[PDB]
């Protein structure tokens, strides 16, 4: 998921 | 825009001295997690093991917040660690110097978080006996702040789940449990508690 | 022109604050491609494989452009990849820092383009079951933004094919196929989109 | 709180030129102390053995004292061992540079007392012969100053046990004894003395 | 036991 | 008189910004010699070879000139690498970063001439099969520019034979040739010409 | 008087300019000695050899001195290599780079003299065969400036004799004899003379 | 060919 | 053999 | 043996 792609868990930090 | 992101960064870091860390006075709370890619290594004749892995870590400082609506609606900038103060969070039991694999560029957003991800390649002390067996071996080795006490640096995580979603799916090695747990360590000269975060993998040779 | 050149790089590079990087506003295109030297390193004890290629780079910033007219008809200069930007495209699988076999330095044109070509070591993870068999074996490894959406870098290819023309003529291995191919993923919790170049690389030892 | 610490650091770091070091006038007290880890290698065909530690030093600078008064009620702070003078101890026996485990960070306090502790592993010479015995092996490898005498440096430390309560629980080595205990030279010729702390580990393979 | 954790030890210097 | 000297380094270094590299309207030659020293590592099971030599680069700049009786007769003088532009010329088929083993200091003389003998140890792509033959094996690894067309920087050697005069006596191989001759190569897509210098080296195991 | 060491070191370092190395002129004379601690590595497969030792460096600069009754009668004082001036003197023979393993830190005396003494860790060229023998094997290294004279940088040693006072009891090998000869070299074309030290180490597998 | 010489592409970027 | 050596090549670079 | 003890060496240069 997100929170396992770094770009994207650091993108959408309220998620992740 | 290019011009009020080169603003918001001039304005918070060039016109400040850095951010000198947390103190018993302004604590901070940093946020561990682990996504585990492989185990790379496994040395029975010095026991040593070699993991790699994403460590993401957040925390959040008011010296860095900023109104986006002041800053042409910006929300968050990326920038290199260097250009930021970073937790000194270490593993307690490695073996070699740690190696990074990734950039060194952090993820600021205006209410002051930060977020950083080093991809990384540790070794670290572990008897591999038994992993040639269906039982299958366990390996621990624990995250912690190298000089500041749970009173300046609180460690937390999200979860107790290892992220395995990407390991690799071809591994030489089955993960049969991997988890991060929070840990408190008291000594009875002092009132000041020292935390860690406990990284427990239990695996085996895939048959 | 020497003077020229001199005067030209100052104002490039000492006249204004350094490209912040790109943003959702002014995004950025990266344009990448492998040239295939050798595959130097198959470890199947461990599910490494060690690969030598050129990784070529290409994007554009408004930032580097000048009018060669004001300049001596300079209409490009090469400087040490220092001096500028660089995107932070980065192996996804990699098991150890990757290592830079050749000078880094960028080629700066009057548009504004910038090409760097980096030589380059790389070790990742792959099972090399099958690699001393006709079938051989397939490895992949995907080219990333670390921190970058594609909303902010999007990342190309100019073509799909792994450029093979300079593959060692005495190498161990046969490569079957090469491949560089962008590939998209989306999650549904977030609008952006994120993007990486996939290096499929299917080979076998040569008989 | 935030503010005073600041200029605490500027006032004793840019304020002021660097310590230029020990004198036989204006002489340094450094304690030195080890946490053996593991014993991480053990080379018979080269007589080489590699240890794993932390290394505790401890020493006391004027030049580092503050009132608390005059600044929030500060007693101590955290700081990059770089932006400090450290002691030139050296391992006199190593085979290989010291490669640094932790981060580098030193605690200093309003009385000029600075601590540091470094995670290391060392190389050293040490012909292993007999680990594979009962009685097994004694190794040993002396600190001190590399161009300090001991009227510029007094070397001492504060136990004569080297601290095993952290050795590796599986380690393929069982510790029969560890010490480190301070030596004094005198050479004819010369009045003033050197000073090493010799540390000295005997050991077993576990069975 | 604090004295083998280093940050305890930088912490309690008079014991450590 | 060290002061002439010190003058000297003074007006060509600091007083105007560094030599920023040749160009199509301000070409270089650099000649190129290399002094091999021994054959230090032939792998057969991932075709690389590591040789130790001495590489002599050559090459002149206008801006490096000076009058020997406006500087006390002086007619060159010593300097960091560092200092100085030198030509990127780089081996296109190493494996490993190359590894230096002498002091970076260039030689400048009043003609602007100057003269850079890095010591080096490469490895690079070749397979050794027939080594140990009679017949013994050709490698072969090419020198050239990394950025820079041939209207830009023209390469040359003085002479096509390696210097062998201080090929180690008792190596594990005898050189039955080596060379190293200068290529021209055209793309047909493009007028400007592309040189290297070929090192190619025959050799076998001594008996 | 702390204070009088900081106004020394000030008046050296920072108001005066870093010497530039020798001259014609000015030429300058470099002692050397070595110091063996063992023969770390033999390598009967590469024909490379390892050894750890001590190398004593001694020069005198004009540039270097002052007078004590100036500076609170300091007669002589410590200070990290990287403040001064160092000779390029250098293995002519290694086949890795040198690893440094002691602080480096040089003495210099109000008399302008400074001695440097690095341990060091070198990698050469010799072929071994013959150490399991009687007679044993001997193995040379030639040290010397990689790019002056001796018309600038004459070349000595105090004794002919290698220091073995602090060769490892233990020692995997015995040696025989290690001397450390000054060696002058005339060539037809050039006036100029040209300075080696010549370490030449006989040894063999204990008995 | 020219693309796979780093000094002909860089010099050539239209092409490669 | 002045050529030969690093030292004596860098000091006559008109023969070397 | 101040000069195989390179502290002492520095020292004692008169005699080292």
């Avoid at chain 2, 991800?117 to 038994?130: E, K, N, V, Y």
């Avoid at chain 2, 789940?161 to 990407?166: K, T």
Wanted: hydrophobic fraction near 30%; charge should be negative; aromatic fraction near 10%.
């Amino acid at each position: 998921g997100c929170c396992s792609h770094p770009a994207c868990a650091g993108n959408n930090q309220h998620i992740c | 825009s290019q011009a009020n992101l080169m603003r918001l960064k001039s304005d918070l870091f060039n016109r400040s001295p850095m951010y000198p860390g947390p103190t018993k006075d302004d604590p901070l709370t940093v946020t561990l997690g682990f996504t585990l890619q492989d185990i790379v290594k496994v040395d029975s004749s010095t026991n040593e093991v070699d993991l790699v892995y994403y460590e993401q870590q957040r925390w959040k400082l008011n010296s860095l917040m900023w109104d986006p609506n002041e800053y042409g609606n910006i929300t968050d900038f990326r920038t290199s660690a260097a250009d930021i103060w970073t937790p000194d969070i270490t593993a307690y039991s490695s073996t070699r110097p740690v190696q990074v694999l990734s950039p060194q560029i952090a993820v600021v957003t205006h209410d002051g978080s930060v977020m950083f991800i080093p991809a990384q390649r540790l070794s670290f002390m572990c008897d591999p006996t038994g992993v040639d067996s269906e039982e299958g071996v366990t390996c621990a080795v624990k995250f912690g702040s190298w000089v500041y006490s749970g009173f300046e640096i609180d460690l937390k995580t999200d979860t107790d789940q290892v992220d395995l979603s990407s390991y690799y799916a071809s591994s030489k090695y089955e993960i049969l449990s991997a988890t991060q747990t929070r840990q408190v360590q008291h000594y009875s000269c002092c009132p000041e508690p020292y935390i860690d975060v406990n990284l427990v993998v239990k695996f085996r040779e895939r048959r």
